[PDB]
Design a protein around this motif. Structure first.
Motif, PDB file in Angstrom:
ATOM      1  N   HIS A  98      43.217  52.654  43.046  1.00 48.36           N
ATOM      2  CA  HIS A  98      43.107  51.595  42.451  1.00 48.36           C
ATOM      3  C   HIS A  98      43.945  50.297  43.576  1.00 48.36           C
ATOM      4  N   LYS A 101      42.605  49.917  47.008  1.00 46.07           N
ATOM      5  CA  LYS A 101      41.779  49.217  47.480  1.00 46.07           C
ATOM      6  C   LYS A 101      42.503  47.310  46.908  1.00 46.07           C
ATOM      7  N   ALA A 105      41.401  45.081  49.733  1.00 49.96           N
ATOM      8  CA  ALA A 105      40.679  44.100  49.514  1.00 49.96           C
ATOM      9  C   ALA A 105      41.572  42.307  48.633  1.00 49.96           C
ATOM     10  N   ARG A 116      47.050  40.954  39.636  1.00 51.05           N
ATOM     11  CA  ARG A 116      46.987  40.384  40.496  1.00 51.05           C
ATOM     12  C   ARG A 116      47.553  38.782  40.091  1.00 51.05           C
ATOM     13  N   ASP A 138      44.978  39.543  37.033  1.00 52.39           N
ATOM     14  CA  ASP A 138      44.002  41.121  37.312  1.00 52.39           C
ATOM     15  C   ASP A 138      42.339  40.117  37.213  1.00 52.39           C
TER      16      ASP A 138
ATOM     17  N   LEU C  34      36.602  42.541  41.869  1.00 50.83           N
ATOM     18  CA  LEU C  34      37.405  44.093  42.132  1.00 50.83           C
ATOM     19  C   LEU C  34      38.012  45.030  40.678  1.00 50.83           C
ATOM     20  N   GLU C  35      38.494  46.253  41.089  1.00 48.54           N
ATOM     21  CA  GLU C  35      38.329  47.016  39.301  1.00 48.54           C
ATOM     22  C   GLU C  35      39.680  46.371  39.087  1.00 48.54           C
ATOM     23  N   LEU C  36      39.154  46.986  37.593  1.00 48.75           N
ATOM     24  CA  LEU C  36      40.258  47.183  36.951  1.00 48.75           C
ATOM     25  C   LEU C  36      41.547  47.977  36.322  1.00 48.75           C
TER      26      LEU C  36
END
Lengths: 356, 70, 37
Positions: A98, A101, A105, A116, A138, C34-36
């Motif tokens: 996770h 990435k 990114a 985030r 996030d 983006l992914e969680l």
């Protein structure tokens, strides 16, 4: 048991570069400037995207005609280093799959934990879209700026990872929107400008016209009413200099009772037939009750039956009027229910002035 | 002699001449007058745009050539 | 010969208001993420 250092490319066609083109401080001042200015900037971005696409296609074709390859990045860019040092308890690289990435990114204020969060961050996606703006929990939130791969742009507010609140948007066909969004679609008050030159200023819901709005069309005539799921349904009025049509609408098509109000503009300066009209303070306006008609099976809501009357022919549309007309109050154009006029080259009609 | 068109304030006598763009539906030229023996006026050439646009309306002539239509 | 008013003899249907333009398809303009955790 992990370390950190990152190098990446930053193409000249990305949300950050579009932002730096403006002489403003932050994103809160970018999305805060005049809407038409934001439209100009996003249109410039769209043109740049089209030029790059065309140049890449042409160069690829030309290099292929000689039987040769490129093996290079066809897009202008810059390399950058991200000064980041982070620790990850995960032993194998997959354990941090996770966060890795995010490192690859997110390109903002990161952390070994989740959620985030940054007041300024520039993320990129596997399709080529790029985001520059604020983050919260996030997902995207607050003022932001989005550049799609296809050349579409957005500079408004975000919430829950989707457009929400005030916004300005430009689409790859050239159509623009200035108004309110709810969950990645139009909602509430909004003005849309279509590629043809027609402007719809009104109310939206779930990304389509819904509620009362005013639609100025390419023919320079305003159509009012109350749309529902995209189509004008119910009582609707349509206006032109010396004309007014007030009638029922079924799935955007007129069908049912109506009233046509027309003024005789061609003969406003030619002498009158009766000396009663010369000095009468009432104009030469008429009014006719009438009705439109649609094939029976059609007009329903989909979930055979005859088709609706399409634009060029209107095959199946009938019109019945069998009463006399009567006098009516004089009309004026444009109707004050439409001002301020959002297009150009709209005439002005009255009876003391004629067509202008 | 093509015929006569009735208007609101005047009428149109219409003559079709041949003159010794120039084909299709513009092969002939048309001169109109309000009264027989009065000064004639040549009508312009027809374009498919205005044919198609008049095919959608239904108007009474006002008998004056320099008048609006729709 | 022709003598008359010039009007055709056919069922007359006045022109409806012109069509309204649609918008861009939402299925091709949608925010990515983006992914969680």
């Amino acid at each position: 048991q992990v370390a950190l250092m990152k190098l990446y490319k930053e193409y000249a066609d990305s949300a950050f570069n579009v932002f730096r083109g403006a002489g403003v401080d932050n994103v809160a001042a970018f999305i805060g400037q005049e809407p038409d200015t934001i439209i100009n900037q996003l249109k410039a971005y769209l043109e740049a995207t089209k030029k790059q696409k065309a140049a890449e296609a042409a160069a690829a074709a030309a290099a292929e005609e000689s039987g040769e390859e490129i093996t290079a990045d066809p897009k202008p860019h810059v390399w950058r280093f991200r000064a980041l040092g982070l620790n990850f308890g995960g032993d194998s690289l997959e354990a941090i799959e996770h966060d890795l990435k995010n490192l690859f990114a997110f390109d903002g204020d990161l952390a070994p934990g989740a959620a985030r969060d940054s007041d300024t961050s520039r993320s990129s996606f596997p399709n080529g879209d790029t985001y520059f703006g604020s983050y919260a929990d996030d997902v995207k939130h607050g003022p932001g700026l989005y550049a799609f791969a296809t050349g579409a742009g957005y500079a408004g507010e975000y919430a829950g990872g989707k457009r929400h609140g005030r916004g300005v948007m430009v689409f790859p066909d050239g159509g623009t929107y200035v108004g309110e969004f709810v969950a990645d679609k139009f909602e509430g008050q909004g003005q849309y400008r279509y590629p043809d030159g027609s402007v719809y200023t009104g109310s939206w819901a779930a990304g389509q016209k819904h509620g009362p709005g005013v639609y100025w069309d390419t023919a320079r005539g305003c159509l009012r009413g109350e749309w529902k799921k995209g189509l004008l349904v119910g009582k609707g009025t349509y206006e032109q200099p010396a004309l007014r049509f007030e009638g029922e609408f079924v799935r955007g098509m007129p069908a049912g009772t109506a009233t046509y109000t027309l003024t005789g503009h061609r003969t406003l300066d030619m002498p009158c037939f009766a000396a009663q009209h010369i000095q009468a303070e009432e104009g030469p306006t008429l009014a006719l009750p009438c009705a439109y008609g649609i094939p029976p099976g059609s007009g329903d809501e989909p979930q055979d039956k005859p088709p609706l009357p399409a634009h060029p022919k209107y095959e199946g549309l009938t019109f019945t009027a069998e009463q006399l007309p009567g006098a009516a109050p004089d009309t004026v154009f444009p109707p004050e229910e439409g001002k301020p006029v959002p297009i150009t080259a709209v005439p002005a009609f009255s009876v003391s002035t004629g067509l202008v | 002699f093509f015929g006569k068109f009735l208007g609101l304030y005047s009428d149109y006598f219409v003559f079709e001449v041949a003159f010794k763009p120039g084909k299709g539906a513009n092969k002939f030229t048309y001169l109109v007058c309000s009264s027989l023996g009065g000064p004639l006026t040549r009508l312009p050439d027809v374009t498919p745009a205005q044919v198609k646009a008049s095919r959608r309306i239904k108007k009474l002539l006002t008998g004056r050539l320099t008048s609006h239509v729709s | 010969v022709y003598v008359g008013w010039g009007v055709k003899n056919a069922p007359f249907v006045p022109l409806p208001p012109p069509p309204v333009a649609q918008e861009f398809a939402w299925g091709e303009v949608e925010t990515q993420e983006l992914e969680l955790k």
